[PDB]
Structure formats: structure tokens, C-alpha cells
Design an enzyme around this catalytic site. Structure first.
Site, mmCIF file in Angstrom:
data_model
loop_
_atom_site.group_PDB
_atom_site.id
_atom_site.type_symbol
_atom_site.label_atom_id
_atom_site.label_comp_id
_atom_site.label_asym_id
_atom_site.label_seq_id
_atom_site.Cartn_x
_atom_site.Cartn_y
_atom_site.Cartn_z
ATOM 1 C CE1 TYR A 89 10.638 4.183 0.481
ATOM 2 C CE2 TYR A 89 10.938 2.583 -1.286
ATOM 3 C CZ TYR A 89 10.106 3.252 -0.403
ATOM 4 O OH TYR A 89 8.754 2.989 -0.430
ATOM 5 C CG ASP A 136 7.902 -0.135 -4.767
ATOM 6 O OD1 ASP A 136 7.078 0.422 -5.513
ATOM 7 O OD2 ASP A 136 8.222 0.301 -3.628
ATOM 8 C CG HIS A 176 6.425 7.975 -1.711
ATOM 9 N ND1 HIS A 176 7.794 7.807 -1.714
ATOM 10 C CD2 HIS A 176 5.900 7.031 -0.895
ATOM 11 C CE1 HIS A 176 8.066 6.776 -0.927
ATOM 12 N NE2 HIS A 176 6.940 6.283 -0.424
ATOM 13 C CE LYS A 232 6.596 3.474 -3.835
ATOM 14 N NZ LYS A 232 7.945 2.952 -3.490
HETATM 15 N N1 LIG Z 1 4.279 3.515 -0.911
HETATM 16 C C1 LIG Z 1 4.654 3.574 0.361
HETATM 17 O O1 LIG Z 1 4.370 4.526 1.100
HETATM 18 C C2 LIG Z 1 5.426 2.412 0.922
HETATM 19 C C3 LIG Z 1 5.532 2.244 2.297
HETATM 20 C C4 LIG Z 1 6.126 1.103 2.808
HETATM 21 C C5 LIG Z 1 6.633 0.155 1.945
HETATM 22 N N2 LIG Z 1 6.580 0.367 0.612
HETATM 23 C C6 LIG Z 1 7.218 -0.613 -0.345
HETATM 24 O O2 LIG Z 1 6.824 -1.923 0.013
HETATM 25 C C7 LIG Z 1 7.995 -2.730 0.269
HETATM 26 C C8 LIG Z 1 7.690 -3.838 1.237
HETATM 27 O O3 LIG Z 1 7.296 -3.305 2.520
HETATM 28 P P1 LIG Z 1 8.296 -3.246 3.772
HETATM 29 O O4 LIG Z 1 9.700 -3.089 3.314
HETATM 30 O O5 LIG Z 1 7.727 -2.226 4.684
HETATM 31 O O6 LIG Z 1 8.131 -4.656 4.511
HETATM 32 P P2 LIG Z 1 7.837 -6.197 4.167
HETATM 33 O O7 LIG Z 1 8.149 -6.457 2.752
HETATM 34 O O8 LIG Z 1 6.481 -6.486 4.715
HETATM 35 O O9 LIG Z 1 8.882 -6.897 5.165
HETATM 36 C C9 LIG Z 1 10.306 -6.761 4.960
HETATM 37 C C10 LIG Z 1 10.971 -7.458 6.116
HETATM 38 O O10 LIG Z 1 10.648 -8.865 6.071
HETATM 39 C C11 LIG Z 1 11.840 -9.632 6.057
HETATM 40 N N3 LIG Z 1 11.612 -10.793 5.212
HETATM 41 C C12 LIG Z 1 11.518 -10.788 3.843
HETATM 42 N N4 LIG Z 1 11.255 -11.959 3.321
HETATM 43 C C13 LIG Z 1 11.161 -12.795 4.422
HETATM 44 C C14 LIG Z 1 10.926 -14.173 4.534
HETATM 45 N N5 LIG Z 1 10.711 -14.970 3.482
HETATM 46 N N6 LIG Z 1 10.936 -14.709 5.772
HETATM 47 C C15 LIG Z 1 11.153 -13.906 6.819
HETATM 48 N N7 LIG Z 1 11.381 -12.589 6.838
HETATM 49 C C16 LIG Z 1 11.380 -12.091 5.596
HETATM 50 C C17 LIG Z 1 12.926 -8.697 5.543
HETATM 51 O O11 LIG Z 1 14.217 -9.113 6.023
HETATM 52 P P3 LIG Z 1 15.582 -9.098 5.138
HETATM 53 O O12 LIG Z 1 15.491 -7.961 4.154
HETATM 54 O O13 LIG Z 1 16.670 -8.907 6.193
HETATM 55 O O14 LIG Z 1 15.650 -10.450 4.467
HETATM 56 C C18 LIG Z 1 12.492 -7.382 6.179
HETATM 57 O O15 LIG Z 1 12.856 -7.340 7.553
HETATM 58 C C19 LIG Z 1 9.019 -1.691 0.707
HETATM 59 O O16 LIG Z 1 10.349 -2.179 0.733
HETATM 60 C C20 LIG Z 1 8.755 -0.586 -0.311
HETATM 61 O O17 LIG Z 1 9.345 -0.976 -1.550
HETATM 62 C C21 LIG Z 1 5.983 1.454 0.092
HETATM 63 O O1 LIG Z 2 6.861 6.197 2.827
HETATM 64 C C1 LIG Z 2 7.526 5.089 2.588
HETATM 65 O O2 LIG Z 2 7.557 4.536 1.493
HETATM 66 C C2 LIG Z 2 8.276 4.512 3.756
HETATM 67 C C3 LIG Z 2 8.938 5.541 4.664
HETATM 68 C C4 LIG Z 2 9.972 6.377 3.930
HETATM 69 C C5 LIG Z 2 10.462 7.610 4.680
HETATM 70 C C6 LIG Z 2 10.860 7.360 6.104
HETATM 71 C C7 LIG Z 2 10.228 7.777 7.232
HETATM 72 C C8 LIG Z 2 10.874 7.404 8.405
HETATM 73 C C9 LIG Z 2 12.015 6.697 8.198
HETATM 74 C C10 LIG Z 2 12.976 6.240 9.211
HETATM 75 C C11 LIG Z 2 12.748 6.512 10.555
HETATM 76 C C12 LIG Z 2 13.688 6.171 11.509
HETATM 77 C C13 LIG Z 2 14.864 5.544 11.138
HETATM 78 C C14 LIG Z 2 15.091 5.254 9.800
HETATM 79 O O3 LIG Z 2 16.241 4.615 9.440
HETATM 80 C C15 LIG Z 2 14.153 5.598 8.834
HETATM 81 S S1 LIG Z 2 12.298 6.478 6.498
#
Ligand SMILES: NC(=O)c1ccc[n+]([C@@H]2O[C@H](COP(=O)([O-])OP(=O)(O)OC[C@H]3O[C@@H](n4cnc5c(N)ncnc54)[C@H](OP(=O)(O)O)[C@@H]3O)[C@@H](O)[C@H]2O)c1
Ligand SMILES: O=C(O)CCCCc1ccc(-c2cccc(O)c2)s1
Length: 316
Positions: free
Chosen positions: A49, A44, A111, A78
Site C-alpha cells: 500500500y 489493517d 497477502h 501482509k
Molecule cells: N487482503 C487483500 O488482498 C485486500 C484487498 C483489498 C482490500 N483489503 C483491505 O480492506 C480494506 C477495505 O477495502 P477497500 O479499501 O477495498 O474498500 P471499502 O472499505 O469497501 O471502501 C472504501 C471506500 O468507501 C468509502 N467510504 C468509507 N466509509 C464510507 C461511508 N461511511 N459512507 C460512504 N463511503 C464510505 C471510502 O471513501 P473515503 O476514504 O474517501 O472516505 C472509500 O472510497 C482495504 O483498505 C485494505 O485494508 C485487503
Molecule cells: O491486494 C490488495 O490488498 C489490494 C491491491 C494492492 C496492489 C495494487 C494493485 C493495483 C493497484 C492500482 C492500480 C491502478 C492504480 C492505482 O493507484 C493502484 S494497487
């Protein structure tokens, strides 16, 4: 638990993918290489990003190494909010393709439903601090997304952070050519999304759950916020199954027929997060996890609450 879900475009989407928001550009290439090596077949991504070039380096190495064939990968990106104008959509998609070093995307999402003024800034502001909208109607943005399918640049199109009335507006669009394949929304035990999920699934739209671990690295975290990974009630379910709390949090959406995209740049966690096809949560576990709903969001798009298309005023 089968590994892929059938989309309404006829393609199959892996139910477990690697998230890349906040993955540092100097670490994400190795993260994606490790992920592919340990079995991930869905990444994803997003232009906003700022790390798609580095994600792409990893994908390209693994294709060149013949670790995986392009057909076997499912790459998602996205369209950012500043590219909703119909004349900017193709170039935005092509920039993402160039950075990811791909000829097509498996899935391209709007997005957020909110369009912003185009320009260099991802969150353009007026002098008083409000985000400056664009007048392009989202249904016109959807038509521009449909053109990408008809040019061969993307296999599927979808939406993200759309509420049920916004999904319905797409489904009711005059002259709709392709239905959304996916709605990617935040979902976890503190934001369980029962109404929006059932609506989307009833229309043949697959739901992807983002921030499934509660995004502990989100930039705006505060000490008073709830914490899924530290919730004793969730830890207890994990202990009972001899799994980690993160593994329970990933398995939970899988058993709701959702796709889930946990993010990590830590090799051991990338591997841990994939090891979720060897156990089952009971129906009592599922009901218990659902009972923790709080309506609590990682991503509330707080700078855009006056935008006409802000998604989170509606109940769902
Ligand atoms: N469409 C949208 O608007 C939108 C918005 C938000 C997110 N997303 C997508 O969804 C993805 C996932 O959401 P997110 O990045 O917000 O958060 P998440 O996947 O809920 O959490 C990521 C965090 O959890 C930690 N982590 C990962 N695996 C772990 C484990 N097994 N044990 C403990 N900690 C662990 C990671 O640390 P480390 O990386 O340091 O290991 C990082 O700090 C995003 O990266 C993005 O691709 C999309
Ligand atoms: O929509 C999504 O998929 C997740 C958010 C993507 C855009 C962002 C908003 C705010 C962001 C940010 C705010 C403070 C510090 C920093 O390092 C990043 S990044």
C-alpha cells in the site's frame, strides 16, 4: 456483540478495523489518529500500500500521547508477493515493523498465494506483459512465516486470498507448526463466500472481510459495475434501522462472526463506520442480504490468472 474474537493462538482480535489501501500518504496519518481517538483498536496495513510509514507516525503519536497502550492495539500487515522466497521473509517483516514503528505485529498475513520474482517491482513483468512467478512453494513460505512467530516478531500468522484447497494445503502441510489464525478474503453482499467461510470457521480459522463497502474508490471501477452503496434493496434495510447503508454493510459481516475492515480517510465516515455496535440486523435481514450474492469481485488479481497458485479458478 462483543468487540473482539478469540484466535487460535489465544489472542483476541477486534472485529472492526480500519483499512488503509488507497489511503493517501498525506491523509492517512490523520485518518489513523482519528480512528484511534474514536475507538478503533485494529488497523489493517500492507507494504504494497506504500503508506506504512505514515500509518506508523499515527500509531506512534497515539502511543506516545498515552491514548492507547500497545497491548490494546491489533496491528496487521501482509507479506507482498515478491517476498515469498524463504530468505526474504524476515527482512520484509522487519521493514514493515520499522515503517510502522513497532517491535511486533499482532498478525502477519501472506497477502496472496501467488509468489512473484523478487526485485524492486511489485508486479514484475516479462517483455510480453505477464507477471513473472517465483518457484518458491507456498508451503515453504508458510514455514518462513512460522519462523517469525518463533523469533518474537509477530504474535500470529495467517493468509489472505487463499481458496479452500489452498487453506487445506496449509492445514495438511507436512510438519505444520502453526495453523493460520486468519484468512482475509473479499466479502460483501455481492460476494457472500458461504462455502469458504464455513470451511475456515470449521477449522478454527477466523475470517476477515475486506472491501465490505464494495471499494467505491477502487482504481478500475466502471459505470456498469454493481454498487452496494447505491443498491435500493440495501438502502431500504438501512432506512428501516435508522442507519446508513455503510453501517448496514459493516454490521452484516459482524453478525457472521467475521472481522471487517472498512477503509476511510474522511473523519466523519471513520466515526460513522465505528457506530455499529448499537443495532442488530434480523435473521430475515441477514438472509436477504445473503441473497444478493453475485460472485462479483473487486480484487480478481487479473494480471496473474495463469499463475499456478492463482486462487479464483476454483469454485471456492
Ligand atoms: N487482503 C487483500 O488482498 C485486500 C484487498 C483489498 C482490500 N483489503 C483491505 O480492506 C480494506 C477495505 O477495502 P477497500 O479499501 O477495498 O474498500 P471499502 O472499505 O469497501 O471502501 C472504501 C471506500 O468507501 C468509502 N467510504 C468509507 N466509509 C464510507 C461511508 N461511511 N459512507 C460512504 N463511503 C464510505 C471510502 O471513501 P473515503 O476514504 O474517501 O472516505 C472509500 O472510497 C482495504 O483498505 C485494505 O485494508 C485487503
Ligand atoms: O491486494 C490488495 O490488498 C489490494 C491491491 C494492492 C496492489 C495494487 C494493485 C493495483 C493497484 C492500482 C492500480 C491502478 C492504480 C492505482 O493507484 C493502484 S494497487
Amino acid at each position: 456483540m462483543a468487540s473482539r474474537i478469540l484466535l487460535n493462538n489465544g489472542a483476541k482480535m477486534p472485529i472492526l478495523g480500519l483499512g488503509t489501501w488507497k489511503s493517501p500518504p498525506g491523509q492517512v496519518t490523520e485518518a489513523v489518529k482519528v480512528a484511534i481517538d474514536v475507538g478503533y483498536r485494529h488497523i489493517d496495513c500492507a507494504h504494497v500500500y506504500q503508506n506504512e510509514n505514515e500509518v506508523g507516525v499515527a500509531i506512534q503519536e497515539k502511543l506516545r500521547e498515552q491514548v492507547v497502550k500497545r497491548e490494546e492495539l491489533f496491528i496487521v500487515s501482509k507479506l507482498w508477493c515478491t517476498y515469498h522466497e524463504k530468505g526474504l521473509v524476515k527482512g520484509a517483516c522487519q521493514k514493515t515493523l520499522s515503517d510502522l514503528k513497532l517491535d511486533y505485529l499482532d498478525l502477519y498475513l501472506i497477502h496472496w498465494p501467488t509468489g512473484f520474482k523478487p526485485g524492486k517491482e511489485f508486479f514484475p513483468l516479462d517483455e510480453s506483459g505477464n507477471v513473472v512467478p517465483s518457484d518458491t512453494n507456498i508451503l515453504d513460505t508458510w514455514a518462513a512465516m512460522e519462523e517469525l512467530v518463533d523469533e518474537g516478531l509477530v504474535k500470529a500468522i495467517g493468509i489472505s486470498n487463499f481458496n479452500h484447497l489452498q487453506v487445506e494445503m496449509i492445514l495438511n502441510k507436512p510438519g505444520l507448526k502453526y495453523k493460520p489464525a486468519v484468512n482475509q478474503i473479499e466479502c460483501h453482499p455481492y460476494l457472500t463466500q458461504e462455502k469458504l467461510i464455513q470451511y475456515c470457521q470449521s477449522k478454527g480459522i477466523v475470517v476477515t472481510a475486506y472491501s465490505p463497502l464494495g471499494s467505491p474508490d477502487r482504481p478500475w471501477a466502471k459505470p456498469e459495475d454493481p454498487s452496494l452503496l447505491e443498491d435500493p434493496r440495501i438502502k431500504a434495510i438501512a432506512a428501516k434501522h435508522n442507519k446508513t447503508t455503510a453501517q448496514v454493510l459493516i454490521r452484516f459481516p459482524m453478525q457472521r462472526n467475521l472481522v471487517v475492515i472498512p477503509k476511510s480517510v474522511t473523519p466523519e465516515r471513520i466515526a460513522e463506520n465505528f457506530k455499529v455496535f448499537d443495532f442488530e440486523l434480523s435473521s430475515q435481514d441477514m438472509t436477504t442480504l445473503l441473497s444478493y450474492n453475485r460472485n462479483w469481485r473487486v480484487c480478481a488479481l487479473l494480471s496473474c490468472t495463469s499463475h499456478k497458485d492463482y486462487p479464483f479458478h476454483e469454485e471456492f
